[PDB]
Write an enzyme that holds these catalytic residues in place. Structure first.
Site, PDB file in Angstrom:
ATOM      1  N   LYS A   1     -37.915  40.490 128.521  1.00 19.22           N
ATOM      2  CA  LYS A   1     -38.715  41.353 129.383  1.00 19.22           C
ATOM      3  C   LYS A   1     -38.371  41.240 130.865  1.00 19.22           C
ATOM      4  O   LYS A   1     -38.922  41.999 131.671  1.00 19.22           O
ATOM      5  CB  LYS A   1     -40.205  41.043 129.195  1.00 19.22           C
ATOM      6  CG  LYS A   1     -40.997  42.151 128.544  1.00 19.22           C
ATOM      7  CD  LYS A   1     -40.447  42.496 127.176  1.00 19.22           C
ATOM      8  CE  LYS A   1     -41.270  43.594 126.491  1.00 19.22           C
ATOM      9  NZ  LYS A   1     -40.823  43.877 125.099  1.00 19.22           N
ATOM     10  N   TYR A   2     -37.491  40.324 131.249  1.00 23.42           N
ATOM     11  CA  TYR A   2     -37.192  40.096 132.653  1.00 23.42           C
ATOM     12  C   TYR A   2     -35.687  40.031 132.861  1.00 23.42           C
ATOM     13  O   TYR A   2     -34.942  39.643 131.954  1.00 23.42           O
ATOM     14  CB  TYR A   2     -37.848  38.797 133.159  1.00 23.42           C
ATOM     15  CG  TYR A   2     -39.370  38.832 133.200  1.00 23.42           C
ATOM     16  CD1 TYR A   2     -40.094  38.575 132.042  1.00 23.42           C
ATOM     17  CD2 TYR A   2     -40.041  39.114 134.387  1.00 23.42           C
ATOM     18  CE1 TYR A   2     -41.460  38.612 132.083  1.00 23.42           C
ATOM     19  CE2 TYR A   2     -41.410  39.145 134.393  1.00 23.42           C
ATOM     20  CZ  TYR A   2     -42.144  38.897 133.248  1.00 23.42           C
ATOM     21  OH  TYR A   2     -43.484  38.928 133.250  1.00 23.42           O
TER      22      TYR A   2
END
Ligand SMILES: O=C(O)CCC(=O)C(=O)O
Ligand SMILES: O=C(O)CCC(=O)C(=O)O
Ligand SMILES: [Co+2]
Ligand SMILES: [Co+2]
EC number: 1.14.11.38
Lengths: 281, 284
Positions: free
Chosen positions: B62-63
């Site tokens: 997610k990052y």
């Protein structure tokens, strides 16, 4: 006084979402067929036939009629009533701004003839941080009330103060500001967060106890008050995926900005770390 | 320009709570011994050595690729579980800070290891895992606290965490500039304590030689809020190895939010979770 609106089980969920904001509660008539009611009812009799336990009882050694966490002892609840598609239709529209939801508690209250009425309240005491959420914030909690026997004026039908989610505080309203929730077994009463309500007791004399199963569905951001983690895997794996997520056995997702999820471990979904099978896997 | 206050580890806790009230953050100097720091890093090294995914990585996917990540260090790092997590100074601060909300527990604790040439983090509030936190009035009882552990020294070059003091009072996070923040330049053993709603970010690693920057973040939250990481899959010999305090932190015991909750939370069969589990602990 404007009374609680009664809707059929297949009523428009858009309409139900408007009743919860306007009045703060509504009634589904005959959501659950009577034989589902009778199954659940005979499964609770089994529980009230259990010997008194020789140890502490958090809410029960507190007092001198109670069945906690009925999902773990009544298969009719966890495999039928917990997964009712209408209820989940209502929760998804209701919780749309906050995201995923799960079952925080479901227990039984039995009220025999001669019992006093219950004080006015909101279902806000278990997670006191709700006391401080403003009215406009996404709701995090929804009360779902199942009459297992007839609710009457005489046997203590639940009293709901319509529109009372607009009050900052409860204060001390009088019984006469509320309306009754008379219902048939199989009906359901849904109650919005911040709405003041109170069971009525059972002023009757002849032996007919009122039965109510209370289910609180919260945002998955809110710790479940009942932890269902001690269920046997074999009982867990014969539930549907929907039930396992309600009872906290899966990874869940608050709405964004939570962009990852919740209830996870090893950076993996809990159901994949446990390699969990489901009835509809 | 005002900086973060460095205190002694033996400092009065009122002094600590006070600085969380007005500045929103502060540093303790030399909380953890060096022997505690070096073995934590050893255990993290053991975990860093593992090639990471044959598949899905919920957070790491997610990052952007600007750091390396070791999740839930309580289950794989004995020093955190048995020493750092139950550090009494950390708990004196938490018990005073969570006075109004009642019991707190560990929502997550993980390693960030940031490589040279990674860009700075954007100024965020740690109110994203539980988005309902945005909506509590500043004055309401706080439900979250971030504890930031330097496992290497923090410097202007390696990207010491940038804190904007007093930012918990802002209405909105908004559009913040870098020199609004002051740097938590720290040495291994210090601790950065950051109140709920403070705006902040990890810095960019602008070093050219030396080991990457390591930080371990621990989020203590009211027991009203669901933990991000669930420690329910730890082995029974492992959990029973922990202390009562350690087990309460990792979700294995019934807890008590403040009244009007007069019963508690995380219970079952109307009994305490550890009773139902016949759970031994290291010190009971
Ligand atoms: O007994 C009823 O019908 C109401 C129960 C209720 O609202 C509660 O137990 O909090
Ligand atoms: O504080 C740090 O340096 C780590 C980055 C951070 O705050 C976060 O990932 O939320
Ligand atoms: Co109630
Ligand atoms: Co952060």
């Amino acid at each position: 006084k404007p009374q609680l609106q009664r809707l059929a089980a297949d009523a428009d969920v858009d309409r139900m979402c408007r009743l919860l904001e306007e009045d703060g509660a509504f009634i589904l008539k005959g959501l659950l067929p009577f034989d589902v009611v009778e199954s659940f009812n005979r499964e609770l009799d089994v529980q009230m036939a259990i010997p008194p336990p020789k140890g502490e009882r958090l809410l029960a050694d507190k007092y001198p009629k109670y069945v906690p966490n009925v999902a773990t002892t009544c298969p009719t609840f966890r495999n039928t009533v917990l997964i009712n598609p209408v209820i989940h239709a209502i929760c998804e529209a209701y919780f749309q701004r906050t995201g995923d939801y799960w079952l925080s508690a479901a227990f039984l209250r039995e009220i025999e003839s001669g019992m006093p009425a219950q004080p006015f309240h909101r279902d806000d005491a278990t997670h006191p941080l709700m006391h401080y959420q403003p009215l406009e914030a996404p709701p995090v909690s929804l009360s779902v009330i199942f009459p297992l026997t007839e609710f009457t004026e005489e046997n203590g039908a639940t009293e709901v103060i319509l529109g009372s989610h607009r009050w900052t505080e409860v204060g001390t309203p009088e019984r006469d500001q509320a309306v009754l929730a008379t219902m048939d077994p199989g009906d359901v009463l849904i109650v919005r967060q911040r709405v003041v309500h109170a069971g009525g007791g059972n002023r009757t004399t002849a032996g007919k106890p009122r039965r109510v199963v209370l289910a609180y569905f919260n945002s998955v951001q809110l710790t479940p008050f009942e932890t269902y983690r001690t269920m046997p895997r074999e009982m867990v794996e014969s539930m549907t995926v929907l039930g396992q997520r309600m009872l906290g056995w899966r990874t869940m997702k608050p709405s964004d900005p939570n962009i990852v999820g919740i209830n996870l471990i090893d950076d993996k979904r809990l159901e994949n770390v446990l390699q969990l099978k489901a009835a509809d896997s």
